[PDB]
Symmetry: D2
Amino acid sequence: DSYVHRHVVTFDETNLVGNVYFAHYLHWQGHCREHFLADHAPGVMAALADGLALVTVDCHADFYAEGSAFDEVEVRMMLDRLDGHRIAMSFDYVRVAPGPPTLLAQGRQTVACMRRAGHGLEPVEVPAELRRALSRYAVVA
Amino acid sequence: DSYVHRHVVTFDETNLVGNVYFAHYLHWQGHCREHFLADHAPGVMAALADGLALVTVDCHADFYAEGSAFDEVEVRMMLDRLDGHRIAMSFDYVRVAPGPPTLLAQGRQTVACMRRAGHGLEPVEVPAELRRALSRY
Amino acid sequence: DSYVHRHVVTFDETNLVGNVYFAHYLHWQGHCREHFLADHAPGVMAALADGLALVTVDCHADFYAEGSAFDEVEVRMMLDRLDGHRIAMSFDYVRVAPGPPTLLAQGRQTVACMRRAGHGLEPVEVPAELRRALSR
Amino acid sequence: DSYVHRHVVTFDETNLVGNVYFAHYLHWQGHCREHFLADHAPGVMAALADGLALVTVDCHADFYAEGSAFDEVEVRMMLDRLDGHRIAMSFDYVRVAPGPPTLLAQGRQTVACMRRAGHGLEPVEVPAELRRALSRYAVVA
């Protein structure tokens, strides 16, 4: 199963060629993880306003098919790895309208849970609530 | 006199038509004012990290001519008004390369000086240093 | 009555202060007029791919209240005037969640309808369907 | 040796944490490769308007240190691979001001040289002028 974040491609996201500028696909990963916390871990987003941080470690995208203005894109997110203070997510970018479902792109991202201090940013274990939520989207065999 | 902030139009700023998306001209006003504080009021820029916030009250733009990817744009900024806690700026967007200088658009913006309160915000008086800098225009 | 475009504020739209960076509110006007065409004038939408362009003449925004990441904003659009080849829209940005509904900001925009005819951009009138739809 | 694109971090690039939003680092790769064409392959720049595109195959970024508004970042670009119709670049994002040069992130990107015939993207061999310009930034041992 995957977490489905819906996006409708806007004109400001299209380059003079007619297709979606590459960097936008990375913004959509951020939206997908944010919308996830809104829906399934609202205590966590919330804490972000009082201490906590989800730091991006790395991100990746691969681009297969051209998107266009007014395409309805699904950013489908799955859990790759949960190890201590770190979270590994993968993404699928499927155009669901107009026309047939088309895999436009695939992405990945790594996030570390941190907090702030005088000594510096310290690694702090994934909040219970977010662990509980992420688990539902793990890939089994 | 005007403060000149240089911008080179990038592909992410151009839509399917081939011209600069309107919204971007408003971002550039932001870059121009920020670049101005870096150059002419650097104490104020440090003070925005601790207490002080510049809030946007309004902004306006009028569009005359189309930009294109790789155009060298001058965002030329002037001081209209200094009104207690408030600052009014205007803008000229001139393409200086390629081809002849062309006025693409003109703009305006209002910014208020605010120092964060118990739970909200309050109007402070334009910082001494920022007043000294707007005086040389 | 007004046309409703829903937007949920994302973190990339917030600056270090904590509130929505001003320039994002102009993009939403763009999303609102585009979303309007998808819903209520899908022929015009298609005509854009071939000749027809909606050129922005001017835009304006006034900012009253601070937005925050995860706020559910309504960009409510109304028709001010329809003048030959031109269209004047206004906008209300209302936070509908969380908490009480709050007017964050007001907006306006003027758009000129334009299809090419020679070595240059030429004023064509408002398409029948778009003239019909703005009236609603 | 590397191609140096300079970027000054603006407020619209910073989130409520105070640091640069991750996705902006991908936009800067775009600016770097574009600025490179302007400087060292201006014929390729002109051919873009008429029937040449550079389609992004993939991109990647790793993040090591936090940027801040007004930091002067160098987006330094090197040529990894030139393989027929393809180009692989790597990127070092170095803060040069304020304080000691600091590696903030590292990125990679793959481009493909594509031309339109009717309504079909065909792979075109890397143009002579860009092939020669990129070559000056190749890795020496």
